[PDB]
Amino acid sequence: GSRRASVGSHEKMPWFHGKISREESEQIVLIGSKTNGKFLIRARDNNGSYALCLLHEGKVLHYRIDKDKTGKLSIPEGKKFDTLWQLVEHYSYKADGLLRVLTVPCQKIGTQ
Protein backbone atom coordinates (compact mmCIF):
# COMPACT_ATOMS: atom_id res chain seq x y z
CA GLY A 1 0.00 0.00 0.00
CA SER A 2 1.14 3.45 -0.97
CA ARG A 3 0.10 6.94 -0.05
CA ARG A 4 -2.97 8.00 -1.93
CA ALA A 5 -6.58 8.76 -1.19
CA SER A 6 -8.80 8.31 -4.21
CA VAL A 7 -7.98 7.91 -7.86
CA GLY A 8 -4.62 9.17 -8.98
CA SER A 9 -5.35 10.45 -12.44
CA HIS A 10 -5.59 8.07 -15.35
CA GLU A 11 -2.91 8.51 -17.93
CA LYS A 12 -4.34 6.14 -20.48
CA MET A 13 -6.23 8.67 -22.53
CA PRO A 14 -5.76 11.53 -24.99
CA TRP A 15 -7.76 14.31 -23.50
CA PHE A 16 -6.37 13.13 -20.19
CA HIS A 17 -2.74 13.93 -19.79
CA GLY A 18 -1.67 14.13 -16.21
CA LYS A 19 1.66 15.52 -17.30
CA ILE A 20 0.85 18.48 -19.51
CA SER A 21 1.22 21.88 -17.94
CA ARG A 22 -1.92 23.75 -18.81
CA GLU A 23 -0.73 25.89 -21.63
CA GLU A 24 0.67 22.89 -23.35
CA SER A 25 -2.88 21.60 -23.41
CA GLU A 26 -4.21 24.99 -24.43
CA GLN A 27 -1.76 25.19 -27.31
CA ILE A 28 -3.03 21.86 -28.36
CA VAL A 29 -6.46 23.36 -28.37
CA LEU A 30 -4.89 25.95 -30.51
CA ILE A 31 -4.36 23.16 -32.93
CA GLY A 32 -7.76 21.73 -32.87
CA SER A 33 -11.16 22.95 -31.86
CA LYS A 34 -13.32 24.74 -34.34
CA THR A 35 -16.84 23.77 -33.68
CA ASN A 36 -16.44 24.82 -30.11
CA GLY A 37 -16.45 21.34 -28.68
CA LYS A 38 -12.84 20.46 -28.06
CA PHE A 39 -11.64 19.91 -24.57
CA LEU A 40 -9.22 18.27 -22.24
CA ILE A 41 -8.98 17.38 -18.62
CA ARG A 42 -5.87 17.64 -16.54
CA ALA A 43 -4.74 16.73 -13.07
CA ARG A 44 -1.94 17.67 -10.74
CA ASP A 45 0.09 16.31 -7.88
CA ASN A 46 0.28 19.13 -5.39
CA ASN A 47 -2.95 19.26 -3.47
CA GLY A 48 -5.58 17.47 -5.48
CA SER A 49 -6.57 19.84 -8.23
CA TYR A 50 -8.17 19.22 -11.58
CA ALA A 51 -9.49 21.51 -14.26
CA LEU A 52 -11.37 21.07 -17.48
CA CYS A 53 -10.14 22.97 -20.49
CA LEU A 54 -12.19 23.48 -23.59
CA LEU A 55 -12.13 26.05 -26.33
CA HIS A 56 -14.86 28.44 -27.28
CA GLU A 57 -13.38 29.15 -30.64
CA GLY A 58 -10.12 30.95 -30.36
CA LYS A 59 -10.99 31.29 -26.69
CA VAL A 60 -9.53 28.52 -24.68
CA LEU A 61 -11.06 28.02 -21.33
CA HIS A 62 -10.38 26.34 -18.10
CA TYR A 63 -12.62 25.25 -15.29
CA ARG A 64 -11.48 24.40 -11.82
CA ILE A 65 -12.72 21.06 -10.62
CA ASP A 66 -12.34 19.53 -7.22
CA LYS A 67 -14.07 17.67 -4.49
CA ASP A 68 -14.74 18.24 -0.84
CA LYS A 69 -11.75 16.22 0.22
CA THR A 70 -14.25 13.44 -0.02
CA GLY A 71 -13.32 12.22 -3.44
CA LYS A 72 -16.31 13.55 -5.33
CA LEU A 73 -14.98 15.74 -8.06
CA SER A 74 -17.29 18.64 -8.62
CA ILE A 75 -17.65 22.17 -9.81
CA PRO A 76 -19.03 25.36 -8.28
CA GLU A 77 -20.97 26.51 -11.29
CA GLY A 78 -20.41 23.28 -13.17
CA LYS A 79 -21.87 20.20 -11.55
CA LYS A 80 -20.80 17.32 -9.39
CA PHE A 81 -19.36 13.91 -10.04
CA ASP A 82 -17.63 10.89 -8.62
CA THR A 83 -14.66 10.99 -10.91
CA LEU A 84 -13.39 12.76 -13.93
CA TRP A 85 -14.88 9.87 -15.80
CA GLN A 86 -18.35 10.87 -14.96
CA LEU A 87 -17.81 14.54 -15.02
CA VAL A 88 -16.18 14.05 -18.36
CA GLU A 89 -18.56 11.56 -19.81
CA HIS A 90 -21.46 13.49 -18.50
CA TYR A 91 -20.13 16.66 -19.87
CA SER A 92 -19.31 14.61 -22.92
CA TYR A 93 -23.03 14.88 -23.26
CA LYS A 94 -23.55 18.48 -22.52
CA ALA A 95 -21.87 21.53 -21.24
CA ASP A 96 -23.90 21.47 -18.06
CA GLY A 97 -22.65 24.98 -17.66
CA LEU A 98 -19.48 25.11 -19.69
CA LEU A 99 -19.15 27.46 -22.58
CA ARG A 100 -20.17 24.66 -24.88
CA VAL A 101 -20.63 20.93 -24.72
CA LEU A 102 -17.75 18.61 -25.33
CA THR A 103 -17.14 16.81 -28.53
CA VAL A 104 -13.41 16.44 -29.08
CA PRO A 105 -10.29 15.63 -27.04
CA CYS A 106 -7.60 18.28 -27.11
CA GLN A 107 -4.45 16.33 -26.69
CA LYS A 108 -2.56 15.19 -29.62
CA ILE A 109 -2.53 11.95 -31.45
CA GLY A 110 0.65 11.41 -33.35
CA THR A 111 3.70 13.30 -34.44
CA GLN A 112 3.32 14.49 -37.98
Binding site: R22, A51, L52, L61, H62, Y63, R64, I75, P76, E77, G78, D96, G97, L98, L99
Partner: peptide, 5 residues
Protein backbone atom coordinates in the same frame (compact mmCIF):
# COMPACT_ATOMS: atom_id res chain seq x y z
CA UNK B 1 -7.62 31.07 -14.86
CA UNK B 2 -11.04 29.54 -14.81
CA UNK B 3 -13.99 30.43 -16.88
CA UNK B 4 -17.35 30.29 -15.26
CA UNK B 5 -18.95 26.96 -15.56
Amino acid sequence: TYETL
